[PDB]
């Protein structure tokens, strides 16, 4: 019973291992194993639950263990090990074959098979930890191991794609430990985590790995927003080390999401409004990306309201996620009509929901945008309007108060009007008739290069596959 369960999963694990084993040996095929490793994460997670945990026990006995003897026992110690044929050396699948890692040449240390075996061993360990939700001592123990091992080994172009997915598990397992319980050991542990990211980033820049730098930057930018340090994030994004070529669309959408929140508090929403749009377009529409689409859609509505523009209501209607968008719908109506009591009562009841995503601090700026938008509505519809006519609509304080609020928006060119104190009425200074001016021409010259932007990123991609197509023999 238990014997047939251990040999079935290990045969499938070696079958998937031998595929990427022969591809990295000859020249550089590394683009091919990258596609296999995408499905390896999903195929291993479903396989971990079946055949209990014993698939990883016999796999270590098969190959040679540099560090991995005590790590399995320590992993099996927390679960109250049940020992069945647990003596090392019970299952031997090698039997002296070249693809089986021939034992005599391996045990005599005349050849080194550890490079591809050890780096692949750490990948399967991190998968069971996140699947079984094992925390506390097992999180810190594995962090003290993998990090020193990566500094000793020299990662080639193919080897840099191994640990690239291991950096995600180091940061994820640490954040789940901090949110579960807070202590003095959690703050000091994050200090080393921030120090290790800066040392390996320089090494990854020399190898010019696209997936490695894409995974690091996404994890590094998130740490900056947790501590709230702009000076660290501002200088980091100025280098532009993030390759846009071979990175996946899921890694791109996460990159544009960070830039929207950085420029939001910098009071420049012109560039931030495009970053939140690019994050949605690059993110897939499937169910696994709903976690990113839920947060990105909530940030888009916050960016618009801070610009003075009001987003469309169909976004809160035709979508299927509107159940979570209900708190942001009441903020849409309160800004339009300019009601002061409606905005104060809206953020009071939903304050509990706004604390989770930390968007309640951005709602403080919305208190000013309620009046700024109401002035824009009445100024565009009414060209020449008196001074006291505004205070009778929005129920403002006095005539001197509204005079200062109108002169505030003309700084950035929002209202585009003038205040005449002698005559005592505000007149709109926009006569339109800009068709004869050169202002539309500035956008025209930019849209000429926008069409050519997709031209240089495309024609190259046609010949990209054609090499291996024409090199293979055709019938």
């Amino acid at each position: 019973l238990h014997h047939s369960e251990k040999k079935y999963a290990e045969e499938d694990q070696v079958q998937e291992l031998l595929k990427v084993l022969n591809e990295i040996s000859k020249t550089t095929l590394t683009l091919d194993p990258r596609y296999i490793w995408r499905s390896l994460k999903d195929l291993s997670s479903l396989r971990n639950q079946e055949l209990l945990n014993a698939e990883t026990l016999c796999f270590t006995v098969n190959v040679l263990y540099p560090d991995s003897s005590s790590f399995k026992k320590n992993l099996l110690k927390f679960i109250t090990s049940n020992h069945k044929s647990s003596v090392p050396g019970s299952a031997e699948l090698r039997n002296s074959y070249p693809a089986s890692f021939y034992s005599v040449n391996t045990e005599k240390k005349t050849i080194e098979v550890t490079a591809e075996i050890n780096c692949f061993m750490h990948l399967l360990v991190q998968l069971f930890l996140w699947d079984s939700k094992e925390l506390e001592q097992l999180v810190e123990f594995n962090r003290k191991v993998v990090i020193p091992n990566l500094l000793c080994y020299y990662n080639l172009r193919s080897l840099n794609l191994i640990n690239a997915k291991l950096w995600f598990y180091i940061y994820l397992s640490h954040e789940t430990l901090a949110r579960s319980s807070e202590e003095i050991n959690s703050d000091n542990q994050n200090i080393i985590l921030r120090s290790t990211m800066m040392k390996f980033l320089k090494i990854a820049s020399l190898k010019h790995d696209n997936e490695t730098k894409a995974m690091l930057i996404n994890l590094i930018l998130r740490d900056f927003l947790n501590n709230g340090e702009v000076d660290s994030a501002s200088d980091f994004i100025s280098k532009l080390e993030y390759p846009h070529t071979d990175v996946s669309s899921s890694l791109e959408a996460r990159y544009f999401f960070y830039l929207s929140k950085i420029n939001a508090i910098q009071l420049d929403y012109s560039t931030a409004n495009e970053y939140i749009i690019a994050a949605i377009r690059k993110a897939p529409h499937n169910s696994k990306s709903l976690g990113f689409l839920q947060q990105s859609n909530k940030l888009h509505c916050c960016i618009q309201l801070l610009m003075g523009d009001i987003p469309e209501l169909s976004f809160f209607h035709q979508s299927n996620m509107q159940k979570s968008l209900l708190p942001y719908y009441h903020l849409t109506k309160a800004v339009k009509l300019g009601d002061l009591k409606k905005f104060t009562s809206t953020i009071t009841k939903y304050k509990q929901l706004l604390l989770k995503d930390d968007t309640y601090q951005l709602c403080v700026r919305l208190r000013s945008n309620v009046i700024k938008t109401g002035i824009r509505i009445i100024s565009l519809t009414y060209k020449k309007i008196s001074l006291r006519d505004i205070c009778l609509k929005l129920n403002l304080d006095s005539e001197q108060t509204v005079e200062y609020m109108v002169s505030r928006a003309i700084r950035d060119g929002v209202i585009e009007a003038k205040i005449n104190h002698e005559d005592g009425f505000i007149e709109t200074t926009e006569l339109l008739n800009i068709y004869d001016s050169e202002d539309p021409q500035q956008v025209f010259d930019e849209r000429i290069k926008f069409a050519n932007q997709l031209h240089d990123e495309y024609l190259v991609s046609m010949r990209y596959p054609e090499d291996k197509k024409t090199q293979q023999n055709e019938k």
Partner: peptide, 27 residues
């Protein structure tokens, strides 16, 4: 799709226009 469907108005229903018939005879 903006300022259209659910927000509506909550005016311009009855009492506002019902008075307008009296204004024609007051001029």
């Amino acid at each position: 799709e903006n300022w259209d469907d659910v927000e509506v108005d909550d005016d311009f229903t009855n009492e506002l226009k019902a008075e307008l018939d009296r204004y024609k005879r007051e001029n």
